[PDB]
Amino acid sequence: PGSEFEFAAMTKELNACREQLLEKEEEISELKAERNNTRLLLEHLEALVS
Amino acid sequence: GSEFEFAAMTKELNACREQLLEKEEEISELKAERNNTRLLLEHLEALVSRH
Numbered sequence: 236p237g238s239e240f241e242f243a244a245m246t247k248e249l250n251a252c253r254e255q256l257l258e259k260e261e262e263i264s265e266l267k268a269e270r271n272n273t274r275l276l277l278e279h280l281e282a283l284v285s
Numbered sequence: 286g287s288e289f290e291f292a293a294m295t296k297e298l299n300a301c302r303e304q305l306l307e308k309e310e311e312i313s314e315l316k317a318e319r320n321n322t323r324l325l326l327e328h329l330e331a332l333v334s335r336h
Contacts, residue, residue, distance in 0.1 A: 238291065241291075242290075242291060242294060245294050245295065245298050246294065248298060249294070249297060249298045249301055252298070252301040252302060252305050253301060255305055256301070256304060256305055256308065259305065259308040259309060259312060260308060262312055263308060263311055263312055263315065266312065266315040266316065266319065267315065269319065270315065270318065270319065273319070273322050273326075276326075277322065277325075280329070
């Protein structure tokens with residue numbers, strides 16, 4: 236009864252959490268790619284100034 | 286409907302929670318690093334645009 240409600244709540248959260256795992260991993264990759272490009276830009280700027 | 290199903294689901298949900306937090310913290314740290322370079326570039330842009 237209450238065991239069913241709670242187990243259903245856990246199953247619901249677990250599914251949502253797993254969906255987010257993929258999404259957040261993708262964002263991490265996006266951020267790392269943006270970071271790498273910014274590093275290159277900053278390197279080019281340093282070269283040009285000095 | 287196993288006997289140890291509830292305990293198993295509990296452990297699996299906690300594992301996922303921990304994995305998710307780990308990613309969220311890395312995202313926050315990366316955004317912190319991005320904010321640093323972002324402010325730098327905006328500073329550089331302002332100096333040249335002022336010129």
